[PDB]
Design an enzyme around this catalytic site. Sequence first.
Site, PDB file in Angstrom:
ATOM      1  N   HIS B  90       0.732  -1.174   0.115  1.00 53.06           N
ATOM      2  CA  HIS B  90      -0.203   0.033   0.133  1.00 53.06           C
ATOM      3  C   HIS B  90       0.753   1.340  -0.213  1.00 53.06           C
ATOM      4  O   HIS B  90       0.463   2.377  -0.276  1.00 53.06           O
ATOM      5  CB  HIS B  90      -0.957   0.132   1.107  1.00 53.06           C
ATOM      6  CG  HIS B  90      -2.456   0.636   0.909  1.00 53.06           C
ATOM      7  ND1 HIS B  90      -3.393   0.335   1.395  1.00 53.06           N
ATOM      8  CD2 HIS B  90      -2.598   1.341  -0.102  1.00 53.06           C
ATOM      9  CE1 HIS B  90      -4.251   0.767   0.837  1.00 53.06           C
ATOM     10  NE2 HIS B  90      -3.873   1.559  -0.073  1.00 53.06           N
ATOM     11  N   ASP B 113      -9.984  -1.187   3.382  1.00 49.94           N
ATOM     12  CA  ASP B 113      -9.115  -1.738   3.776  1.00 49.94           C
ATOM     13  C   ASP B 113      -9.520  -2.295   5.137  1.00 49.94           C
ATOM     14  O   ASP B 113     -10.236  -1.807   5.489  1.00 49.94           O
ATOM     15  CB  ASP B 113      -7.778  -0.572   4.022  1.00 49.94           C
ATOM     16  CG  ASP B 113      -6.365  -1.139   4.143  1.00 49.94           C
ATOM     17  OD1 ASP B 113      -5.670  -0.411   3.903  1.00 49.94           O
ATOM     18  OD2 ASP B 113      -6.234  -2.345   4.668  1.00 49.94           O
ATOM     19  N   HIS B 115      -7.494  -2.180   7.489  1.00 48.68           N
ATOM     20  CA  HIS B 115      -6.691  -1.541   8.173  1.00 48.68           C
ATOM     21  C   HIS B 115      -6.886  -0.143   8.054  1.00 48.68           C
ATOM     22  O   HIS B 115      -7.109   0.232   6.877  1.00 48.68           O
ATOM     23  CB  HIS B 115      -5.125  -2.073   7.999  1.00 48.68           C
ATOM     24  CG  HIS B 115      -5.028  -3.541   8.102  1.00 48.68           C
ATOM     25  ND1 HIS B 115      -4.880  -4.127   6.788  1.00 48.68           N
ATOM     26  CD2 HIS B 115      -5.051  -4.375   9.234  1.00 48.68           C
ATOM     27  CE1 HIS B 115      -4.809  -5.638   7.431  1.00 48.68           C
ATOM     28  NE2 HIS B 115      -4.767  -5.614   8.613  1.00 48.68           N
ATOM     29  N   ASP B 117      -3.835   1.824   7.986  1.00 46.92           N
ATOM     30  CA  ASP B 117      -2.754   2.584   7.696  1.00 46.92           C
ATOM     31  C   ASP B 117      -2.364   3.837   8.089  1.00 46.92           C
ATOM     32  O   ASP B 117      -1.884   4.590   7.425  1.00 46.92           O
ATOM     33  CB  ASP B 117      -2.752   2.414   6.088  1.00 46.92           C
ATOM     34  CG  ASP B 117      -2.943   0.956   5.690  1.00 46.92           C
ATOM     35  OD1 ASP B 117      -2.800   0.092   6.437  1.00 46.92           O
ATOM     36  OD2 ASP B 117      -2.990   0.581   4.365  1.00 46.92           O
ATOM     37  N   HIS B 130       3.730   0.460   5.030  1.00 46.41           N
ATOM     38  CA  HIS B 130       2.627   0.379   4.450  1.00 46.41           C
ATOM     39  C   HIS B 130       1.418   0.596   5.403  1.00 46.41           C
ATOM     40  O   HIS B 130       0.128   0.723   5.226  1.00 46.41           O
ATOM     41  CB  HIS B 130       2.371  -0.960   3.682  1.00 46.41           C
ATOM     42  CG  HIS B 130       2.523  -2.215   4.474  1.00 46.41           C
ATOM     43  ND1 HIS B 130       1.776  -3.500   4.153  1.00 46.41           N
ATOM     44  CD2 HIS B 130       2.694  -2.235   5.944  1.00 46.41           C
ATOM     45  CE1 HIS B 130       1.864  -4.299   5.270  1.00 46.41           C
ATOM     46  NE2 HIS B 130       2.535  -3.590   6.274  1.00 46.41           N
ATOM     47  N   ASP B 220      -7.002  -1.970  -0.840  1.00 53.42           N
ATOM     48  CA  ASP B 220      -6.262  -2.929  -0.536  1.00 53.42           C
ATOM     49  C   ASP B 220      -7.059  -4.296  -0.456  1.00 53.42           C
ATOM     50  O   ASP B 220      -8.269  -4.179   0.085  1.00 53.42           O
ATOM     51  CB  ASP B 220      -5.934  -2.643   0.933  1.00 53.42           C
ATOM     52  CG  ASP B 220      -4.956  -3.514   1.857  1.00 53.42           C
ATOM     53  OD1 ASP B 220      -4.897  -4.565   1.100  1.00 53.42           O
ATOM     54  OD2 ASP B 220      -4.386  -3.215   2.619  1.00 53.42           O
ATOM     55  N   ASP B 222      -6.987  -6.867   1.081  1.00 54.08           N
ATOM     56  CA  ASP B 222      -7.315  -7.533   2.438  1.00 54.08           C
ATOM     57  C   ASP B 222      -8.508  -6.734   3.281  1.00 54.08           C
ATOM     58  O   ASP B 222      -8.901  -7.639   4.082  1.00 54.08           O
ATOM     59  CB  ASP B 222      -6.029  -7.469   3.377  1.00 54.08           C
ATOM     60  CG  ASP B 222      -5.593  -6.324   3.911  1.00 54.08           C
ATOM     61  OD1 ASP B 222      -6.561  -5.084   3.925  1.00 54.08           O
ATOM     62  OD2 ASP B 222      -4.425  -5.904   4.420  1.00 54.08           O
ATOM     63  N   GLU B 265      -1.788  -4.711  -2.265  1.00 59.77           N
ATOM     64  CA  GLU B 265      -1.387  -5.878  -1.702  1.00 59.77           C
ATOM     65  C   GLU B 265      -1.823  -7.338  -2.023  1.00 59.77           C
ATOM     66  O   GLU B 265      -1.919  -8.217  -1.107  1.00 59.77           O
ATOM     67  CB  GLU B 265      -2.256  -5.667  -0.232  1.00 59.77           C
ATOM     68  CG  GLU B 265      -1.546  -4.335   0.517  1.00 59.77           C
ATOM     69  CD  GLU B 265      -0.101  -4.525   1.121  1.00 59.77           C
ATOM     70  OE1 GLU B 265       0.325  -5.539   1.314  1.00 59.77           O
ATOM     71  OE2 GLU B 265       0.148  -3.531   1.823  1.00 59.77           O
TER      72      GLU B 265
HETATM   73  C1  LIG Z   1       0.288  -3.553  12.481  1.00 62.23           C
HETATM   74  C2  LIG Z   1      -0.145  -2.664  11.446  1.00 62.23           C
HETATM   75  N1  LIG Z   1      -1.235  -1.638  11.754  1.00 62.23           N
HETATM   76  C3  LIG Z   1      -0.430  -3.414  10.186  1.00 62.23           C
HETATM   77  C4  LIG Z   1      -0.598  -2.859   8.825  1.00 62.23           C
HETATM   78  C5  LIG Z   1      -1.043  -3.419   7.623  1.00 62.23           C
HETATM   79  C6  LIG Z   1      -0.900  -2.676   6.315  1.00 62.23           C
HETATM   80  B1  LIG Z   1      -2.115  -3.125   5.272  1.00 62.23           B
HETATM   81  O1  LIG Z   1      -3.195  -2.240   5.166  1.00 62.23           O
HETATM   82  O2  LIG Z   1      -1.998  -4.247   4.566  1.00 62.23           O
HETATM   83  C7  LIG Z   1       1.116  -1.903  10.999  1.00 62.23           C
HETATM   84  O3  LIG Z   1       2.192  -2.277  10.836  1.00 62.23           O
HETATM   85  O4  LIG Z   1       1.236  -0.635  11.324  1.00 62.23           O
HETATM   86 MN   LIG Z   2      -3.519  -1.073   3.165  1.00 55.79          MN
HETATM   87 MN   LIG Z   3      -4.586  -3.945   4.720  1.00 53.27          MN
END
Ligand SMILES: C[C@](N)(CCCCB(O)O)C(=O)O
Ligand SMILES: [Mn+2]
Ligand SMILES: [Mn+2]
Lengths: 308, 308, 308
Positions: B90, B113, B115, B117, B130, B220, B222, B265
Amino acid sequence: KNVSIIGSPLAAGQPLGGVQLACDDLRKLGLHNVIDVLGWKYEDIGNIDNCYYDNIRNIKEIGIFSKNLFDTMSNELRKKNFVLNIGGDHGVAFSSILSSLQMYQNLRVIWIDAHGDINIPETSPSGNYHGMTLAHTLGLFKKKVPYFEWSENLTYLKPENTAIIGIRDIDAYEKIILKKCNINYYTIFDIEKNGIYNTICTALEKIDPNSNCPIHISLDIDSVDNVFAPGTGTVAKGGLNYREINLLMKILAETKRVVSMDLVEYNPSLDEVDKKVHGDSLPILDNATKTGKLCLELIARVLGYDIV
Amino acid sequence: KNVSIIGSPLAAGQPLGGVQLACDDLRKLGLHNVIDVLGWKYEDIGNIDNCYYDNIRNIKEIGIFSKNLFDTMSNELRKKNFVLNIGGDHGVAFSSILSSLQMYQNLRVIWIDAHGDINIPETSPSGNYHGMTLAHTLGLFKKKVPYFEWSENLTYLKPENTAIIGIRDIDAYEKIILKKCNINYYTIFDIEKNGIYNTICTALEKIDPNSNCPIHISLDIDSVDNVFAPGTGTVAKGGLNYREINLLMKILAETKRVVSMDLVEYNPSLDEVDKKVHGDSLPILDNATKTGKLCLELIARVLGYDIV
Amino acid sequence: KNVSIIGSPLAAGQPLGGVQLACDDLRKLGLHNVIDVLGWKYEDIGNIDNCYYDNIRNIKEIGIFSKNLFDTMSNELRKKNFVLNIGGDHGVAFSSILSSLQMYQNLRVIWIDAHGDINIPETSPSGNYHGMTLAHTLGLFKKKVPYFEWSENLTYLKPENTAIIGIRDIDAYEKIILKKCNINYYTIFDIEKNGIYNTICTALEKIDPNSNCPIHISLDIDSVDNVFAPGTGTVAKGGLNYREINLLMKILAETKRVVSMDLVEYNPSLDEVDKKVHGDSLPILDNATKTGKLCLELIARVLGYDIV
Ligand SMILES: C[C@](N)(CCCCB(O)O)C(=O)O
Ligand SMILES: [Mn+2]
Ligand SMILES: [Mn+2]
Ligand SMILES: C[C@](N)(CCCCB(O)O)C(=O)O
Ligand SMILES: C[C@](N)(CCCCB(O)O)C(=O)O
Ligand SMILES: [Mn+2]
Ligand SMILES: [Mn+2]
Ligand SMILES: [Mn+2]
Ligand SMILES: [Mn+2]
């Protein structure tokens, strides 16, 4: 509360064998016991035995089979029994719907399917009849069909009196035919937007605004997602889930107007096991393959099977 | 109806390799054929080649790559083509969004997403870029970033002009950052409550009340549940299902205002097969891995692919 | 923010052992760490040690165990702690609910289950007590129960003050008992029609119109679909999905009126792995079996765990 059971083991509408085994498989899994426990009486009629288009595969077998099914089902319909037609591929719906329609002129048809089955022979990419059956039934064919002369003077189904529900895999030409003939259709996206309940209520309101017409259900089990219904020949991702298809059948049962039904495209040879969990409470064979068990459960729903 | 395709095989924003293979994998699976069949013309630009924070991993590679992507994408955007940026992790969204924003000052961003990010380097538990890309893009970073000097005078994205959709795995500090910056966010619980359709309509109404702004989609993969999208590095339970993600992309397509998009991703090395079912009708390689096939289908949705 | 943890490893309400292992399994998976991270303090009380009907299996063991649980839980309730009762099969809910009810006379009970557990001994097809526990708690039993003399003068739960949610596998006689006693019930079809959010709001409005009553949650993990919760003895198809059960627990947490809870029918011996994905962020053992991990997550929800 009388149901006539007709086995229609036609497999000629599509490449594979397998569906010809469906009728006897559902009997083996406990069709009769299921009907009995729901307080219905049945008569099992057994199995049906077996300028022009020249590009429909296996059409002689289909045409000859369809005459037999039409004659047999007409006779059962006259008893005023609920008629349950177990396929077989979807090709069996032609004689099923038209026989029911000759008796119930104001019939409304709910066609539940991942597919439109609304190709005509000149647009079909496969030449497989089960992908054209709805178009044929709707009077959309433009030339004569070999071995269907017996059907040429029948009254055909009208698009405005039909609703197709669950569709998601439509061919390029079908998309045009669908829009052109003005049939009512409700895609898996409509269902995702509005939910299955609002969707079927909308469909019923659209085709039967006065809630006073007899209903025919033509259920292609491939409308249901492969996770729950792997035992079928033509799979399309993103189908109805277990809760949705059960609820849909329940809502249709509750109209109290269903007079006939097809259950088609079940192919036991492609089916898989879970298997048996406590919730499999209907008198269905322990450890039955999951699509077959689902078929029996959906038949139960139409006959009034409910949670409470 | 012209699309510029940019491959951005950056894998430096997170531990694993795999995502660097995504761009060429989607081409192999039939990206060009899919675009062609939908009536679009494409220009495939190929692949991008490759006081301060000191705690962002691989930042030199990321910074240098991002300058190249920014310059390349700026040039494509000026053609007034729809620009499709295929990652890569990402991290590629920084240059993608900011290049699009310099051209479309009233850009609205839909970030899809599992997450947020939206960590900053001082809150990140991983130091993986990312997981910080959205915060960086929103101007939330508090110190300078090595190898990003080229970006220091750009206009940054505003939180009120952004909606994050599908989130479910947010870090403790991120939860605070999310609330503090006043970004619009819609969690998987909001989606379960209201449905994906109401959710995206609400988001669009919130960030574009007059329905007159260009839209950038940063997807993303995921965000989608592992059942449908196993080919991705950071999985979170309870994601968007197949029907939901397809509908979401369709609704965004129907605004007619999408000007650019990331698809990030996707990691082919983690992907699995179904495989091929009849419903896989787009000109996508038979038996393709399921996440790759889904990516192509979602791109098709944005380009207008619809059921009927 | 104080929780008393009571392990109730009763396995006598149903055929299998397995559930007796649940309490210690959840501790091993990280129950204490989860509670800690959510800002709650706990006191772990450890595990409970261990003219008439003559047709209830294992009733002596159940009756003697229930007296002990009743006495132990009464003592914890008096501390005004939230009390978390971890089974064990659902038989443990009798003493749990009645002890909570003696203290909170206006208690409202939300019973979350695939099943009604509302057979009486004369209607039970199994003689298994865990399938009768709700009926017993509601005062529906018509004769005395061996080894329950200690309970004979307690105030029983009222049907109008109870809501059962998620049901889908009900016995023929249970269907009658359910309608007759006028309990509020919400089937999986109601949930499919209206969504889990509308469903729980409707239930809460029905049993607590003034939003001012203490709530007890009795959660049978088999309410959740087998895809997410295989670790349980009596599975019923078409259960709550991962998103739904998490949202349900969140909404109940947000009332701020939950005073006690059962989590029952978790059987680690039947559980399976995913396993570990990034989204498993709570301090739960890496690679834990999925039902156990889900149990801990749902407990977290009740204690206020939220996405943002
Ligand atoms: C632990 C986590 N919040 C993971 C982020 C994932 C990235 B994604 O959207 O694929 C971080 O590393 O900051
Ligand atoms: Mn992402
Ligand atoms: Mn993600
Ligand atoms: C390609 C296809 N549209 C497939 C039809 C599937 C029939 B069915 O509903 O099971 C055709 O052969 O016309
Ligand atoms: C057949 C059955 N209704 C099963 C009850 C299941 C108990 B449960 O909620 O896990 C009975 O034994 O009474
Ligand atoms: Mn069909
Ligand atoms: Mn079909
Ligand atoms: Mn129970
Ligand atoms: Mn249960």
